[PDB]
Point group: D3
Chain length 257, copies 6
Amino acid sequence: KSVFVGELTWKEYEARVAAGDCVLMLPVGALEQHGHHMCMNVDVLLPTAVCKRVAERIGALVMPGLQYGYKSQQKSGGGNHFPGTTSLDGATLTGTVQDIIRELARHGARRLVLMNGHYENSMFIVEGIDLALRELRYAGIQDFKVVVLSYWDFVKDPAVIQQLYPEGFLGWDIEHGGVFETSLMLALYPDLVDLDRVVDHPPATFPPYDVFPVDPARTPAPGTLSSAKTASREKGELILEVCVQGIADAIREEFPP
Amino acid sequence: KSVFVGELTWKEYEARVAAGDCVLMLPVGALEQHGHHMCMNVDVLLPTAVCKRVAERIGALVMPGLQYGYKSQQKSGGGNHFPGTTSLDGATLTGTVQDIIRELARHGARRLVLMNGHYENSMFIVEGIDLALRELRYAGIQDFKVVVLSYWDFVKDPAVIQQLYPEGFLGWDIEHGGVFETSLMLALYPDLVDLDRVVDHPPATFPPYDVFPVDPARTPAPGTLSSAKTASREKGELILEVCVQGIADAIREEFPP
Amino acid sequence: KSVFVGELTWKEYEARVAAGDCVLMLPVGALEQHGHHMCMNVDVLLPTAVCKRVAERIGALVMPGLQYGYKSQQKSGGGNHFPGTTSLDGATLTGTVQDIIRELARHGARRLVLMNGHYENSMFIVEGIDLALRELRYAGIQDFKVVVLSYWDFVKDPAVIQQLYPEGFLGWDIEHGGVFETSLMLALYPDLVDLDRVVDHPPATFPPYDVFPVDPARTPAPGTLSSAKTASREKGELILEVCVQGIADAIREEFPP
Amino acid sequence: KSVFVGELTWKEYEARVAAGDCVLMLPVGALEQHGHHMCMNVDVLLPTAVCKRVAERIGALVMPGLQYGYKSQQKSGGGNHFPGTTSLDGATLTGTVQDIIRELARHGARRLVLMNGHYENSMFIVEGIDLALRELRYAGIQDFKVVVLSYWDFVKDPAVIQQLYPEGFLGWDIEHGGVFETSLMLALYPDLVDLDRVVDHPPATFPPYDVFPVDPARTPAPGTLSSAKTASREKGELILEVCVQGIADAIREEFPP
Amino acid sequence: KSVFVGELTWKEYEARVAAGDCVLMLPVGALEQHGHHMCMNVDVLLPTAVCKRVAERIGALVMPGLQYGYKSQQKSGGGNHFPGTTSLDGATLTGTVQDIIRELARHGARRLVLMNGHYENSMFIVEGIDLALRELRYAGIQDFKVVVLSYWDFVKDPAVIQQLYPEGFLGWDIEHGGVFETSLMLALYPDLVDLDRVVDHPPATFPPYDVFPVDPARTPAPGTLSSAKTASREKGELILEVCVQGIADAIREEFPP
Amino acid sequence: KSVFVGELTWKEYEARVAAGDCVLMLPVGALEQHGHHMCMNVDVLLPTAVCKRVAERIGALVMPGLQYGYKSQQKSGGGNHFPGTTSLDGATLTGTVQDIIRELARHGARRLVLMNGHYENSMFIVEGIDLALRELRYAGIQDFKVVVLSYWDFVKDPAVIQQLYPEGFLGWDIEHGGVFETSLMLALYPDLVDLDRVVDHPPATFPPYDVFPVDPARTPAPGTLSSAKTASREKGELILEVCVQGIADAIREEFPP
Ligand SMILES: CN(CC(=O)O)C(=N)N
Ligand SMILES: CN(CC(=O)O)C(=N)N
Ligand SMILES: CN(CC(=O)O)C(=N)N
Ligand SMILES: CN(CC(=O)O)C(=N)N
Ligand SMILES: CN(CC(=O)O)C(=N)N
Ligand SMILES: CN(CC(=O)O)C(=N)N
Ligand SMILES: [Mn+2]
Ligand SMILES: [Mn+2]
Ligand SMILES: [Mn+2]
Ligand SMILES: [Mn+2]
Ligand SMILES: [Mn+2]
Ligand SMILES: [Mn+2]
Ligand SMILES: [Zn+2]
Ligand SMILES: [Zn+2]
Ligand SMILES: [Zn+2]
Ligand SMILES: [Zn+2]
Ligand SMILES: [Zn+2]
Ligand SMILES: [Zn+2]
């Protein structure tokens, strides 16, 4: 039986919400350049894949993912000047999250996990949540609860980190098109990665400020912020198990049966 | 090679747009109840599948689809009071279309086909197009051209109509969860249809006005506006060929090499 | 005693709402080209005249009409590229409807009929209604009821259609500046019609898609979508009687005294 | 021939704009309580009547009027708590003005007089103008010129002020439903005034601050801010000529042939 | 102890609101040209200084002031074409006021004085208040009360006006950079005024209409609307005492223990 | 002469912009709880003080600061559920930044430094900049340049961190009301800090997700995310010297004479 809301009938969905402890999950991604070696829908594919596996384990349901996210920023995604990257304005993304929460609440759902896969989305997701909860409070509804997370933050264990990051962990911001995402894609969707096309460059660095209009010269030419040369299917399987396990555990604590 | 932009690298996408006559296609759907016998992501699946086949034929590319559409209306989708149906506000959908066109224009793209799969979306797509073209004009850009269509409108041939609907054509508005959509789904995604669960009610009728708040008693209980009892894979293949050929021809005419 | 809210004192209006069953009616029109032979305020004049007569029969009141409507579309109104046509953005029209409903509800009114006279307004009226009912629900109010209708939909009886169209009906979309509107204008405001200036072209036809920017060649040069050559005062008188009776009956059904 | 754009064909309008110096005029009103003795559409009727007469004199055209205006304020209009008064949000009024200027500019018009008839509208009209002119500049259009006025400000001659206000002029703010508007209505629309119903209270006074929520006790009970007991048709004809002459002269100065 | 909320800890603020009759005051200013002789933050400095003194006297607290206000208008502030003047759009100002009231209500505050220092702000403050009170009404809250005032309106007393203006008071609209503001600044912030730089022109006069785009020729070249040649510290101390006493008394009347 | 734009006349400001290389600086803060020991306007005071000193060194000017910022988040500011914290919606803050940039560009300014003092503001500042630059491009203006920075990012040097934190640096997110801000306040505004009121709790830790509505138990009771027990004036003096030097150097690099 599918864990995807889109693949259920309305009667099946209605029955699941009627159970009374139904957890819904919404992947939030982007269409964004991910270097010479990888396709552009990574930020949708990855959180969706993690949601699917988590949902199988905890008996949750997964909503259709948000395919377009906030403008790529130089220090976390290369920058929005790249071809292919197709970004929403903040108000549009916020409004989309807001509308979806409104509707889930109308259905009777009261438990939502927003799983972000594109670094830049976070604060617009937060605003969408706040505006939706504000509206629910207008109608006397205070029992809608949201958990929001970026899936990579669950990769915390010192031992796990040492495997993908031999010379050190430099941050989730510069994991754009690098070892983390490329490894996951080798594990899940190998036909969409070509590791021989990786342009091996040093981890991108930046001064402690930002400049607009964005200057293309300050992003590595391929659009990646770190090299995925050492990425592997094995690394991807490790990340996947650690994420799925950690997120399933967190969701059970926040949304117990 | 994939016809989906999301499955391309940014370099591959850039090269396709650089050729100068590149046609992009954007499916616009919904998450919406489709009766007891069918799943809720039909309005995304169907135009996406048509886009894919058209794109293969004419050498176009397909953008990630809009998964959430405008509020279901009683006379064309059963109504937004149903569980599962998850709808955007008009401003949100319009803004999403507007943002995407802005970004495609930034890439250098100048040819877009919006393929609607949810009846209620049309006017909000139209407004998104207008607002986007207005903004392009502010930059002296007047060579961006948009074709918008709902894929069912290409099924016009009287002989084909009789083959699909022996008892008579009942209008595309009450083809919600009926013979047309169900037949297409039987041909493309048979596991998401269970024809044994079809409730075989007479076609929905309404007076020449609408009432809000939506009154659930005026929609057939299953949520369908007509019966899919006579739906079949064969009808689906006929529809699919008529739509793909007709749309392929139309796009070749409007966007010639 | 006047049926127009604008022609009442606030005390007279207050007393009518205090009866507890008062029906208010809001004409929603446009300023739009209507060919060489007719003036541009038709879409206001016609629903206002119908509202007046319905209100006289059923004891309703009529609000000041919306004078500007949504952008003219090629297939229904000739297109927004014509001179004279003066159109609102979707958000503006939606917001206007939303504000008016808020205010009527504040007065204690709970029964509203929106009578549309311009084809393109419909979905923005729908959104304005939804947003207003949403806000009322925030205040625990769910007894405000809205009927929305386009007045031409009440010309439906086969006997009536045959009498008005002895050569055949051809649809409401291409009844822009054709026999229907022109006949009504000949009956109500003959000084605003010059039938000698009618250009007698064949009915407009279009492919099953739309193109933006609009291509002006696909609209008949005069701006009409069908010929009003056979329009008459008598046809207009029949349309008027049928519309008024039908709408009066519908409103009594939905809003019994 | 008519001076109202709504009563012209699009060809007649196009020809008038093509002449090169065409002045358009837009009345901006309200639906608002005006005491026990006058109807609620005064703020539309009066500037529309003044526009008509000015247009006849100077060869201008008059657009359909804005029927709904900004929220009535206690110190100028009695307050928005009154029945009947039906007010827009600021953003709605601003957007309406903005949309209309955009469209007039599209037609090729470059001269607009906005004639305000409701005190509270002014700053939202100003913002609408500013936003519209900002957008026009984005397209390299800097030759659209707008004159905005409230018609009563043209009553400046001390001899006229004394005829209306022999005990002294107290300001246009408390001139709500008093001698000025009532006199004009007695001259123009006598059937919409019943002077026997005037409540002859002392002129409304307020402290140098404003309180929200609006306190109904601080407005004179009938909703008028001053008594119309001394209003007369003769005074109305005087006001009408003074306004029409003064506005015609101002428009000739600002928009010379 | 400080009367400024910004200079309190959250515990100190919490305790003051917990008392039950706490009055908060919000200065609303502008960054705007004020002639050759005076700095551009006058409209913040002055209401803030008055707020401080009133708050000391009545035991109120003062919120951080709004530093940026609505677009300067020719007849009241010289016009928004001047350098230095940095103005918000109406929606931005309205939204700021709205957000602050929402948050103060969340804290449990129920008494707010908005003290305006920039003529043009008034209607956007009014709209922000209305939108905030609207949202509070959704939650059943009707005990949040707002007093709004422009501080100069409290200089009313005929005797006071004679001392400040022996040769005649000429209205608050042209008191932009003139005797009133300049005198206050000489009393409070003498280093920010250089009276030798005053350009002594006649009081600004305008016709009874406005023109956009703003024509710079119709504003006195220095940007002032009246001459501050006779401004003095003595006049400033009189104004200050009159304003502080008057406003203190008004706030005690409206927000008593 | 003052480095604050508010303290200049419009002529002085105009002259500085006319020089051709004028750098403007805009502090962007918040009104936010900062523990038991410190006042709530810290996030305005601190970046304003740094801006003042930088401006004095490099010959720049400082605009009036944004006093209200985005909603406090649990992991960086304790959460928006605290009293005193007074937060804007995202759209409001974005619009404020957008409006100010528009206006500065109108003055002829082309170089802006946005100095953020409140962690949560960052993405809304980014969106405001993008929308403003988008509008400038509509007018052919592409030479407006913006540098955005949070002043604490310039305390980077290992030797400086070692001196300030002999026990260990634990990150900027939990430097809310801790050693960093409190030390700066002891150096700049000692009367607004009372170190005896510091609650000396262990550093705040959180799971790798966020929950809404915020659970107040996850924030330390005082609202601080780390203890300021060891804060000192001397630490503050060093932070100030390091920040001012680093930022002055960065601005000269990006905006050379
Ligand atoms: C973690 N990621 C992946 C992405 O969002 O592309 C970052 N770029 N920071
Ligand atoms: C054509 N359709 C299918 C759909 O949009 O669900 C209608 N319901 N009218
Ligand atoms: C019936 N009408 C009337 C109108 O909107 O002008 C159509 N244009 N379709
Ligand atoms: C001048 N007027 C007329 C009106 O707006 O109704 C005032 N109310 N002050
Ligand atoms: C009273 N004021 C002061 C100001 O707003 O600058 C006027 N400009 N009219
Ligand atoms: C450094 N700061 C200070 C603040 O924003 O209050 C962080 N919260 N990170
Ligand atoms: Mn990304
Ligand atoms: Mn549908
Ligand atoms: Mn029409
Ligand atoms: Mn009025
Ligand atoms: Mn001012
Ligand atoms: Mn902060
Ligand atoms: Zn990614
Ligand atoms: Zn469907
Ligand atoms: Zn029409
Ligand atoms: Zn009036
Ligand atoms: Zn001032
Ligand atoms: Zn802080």
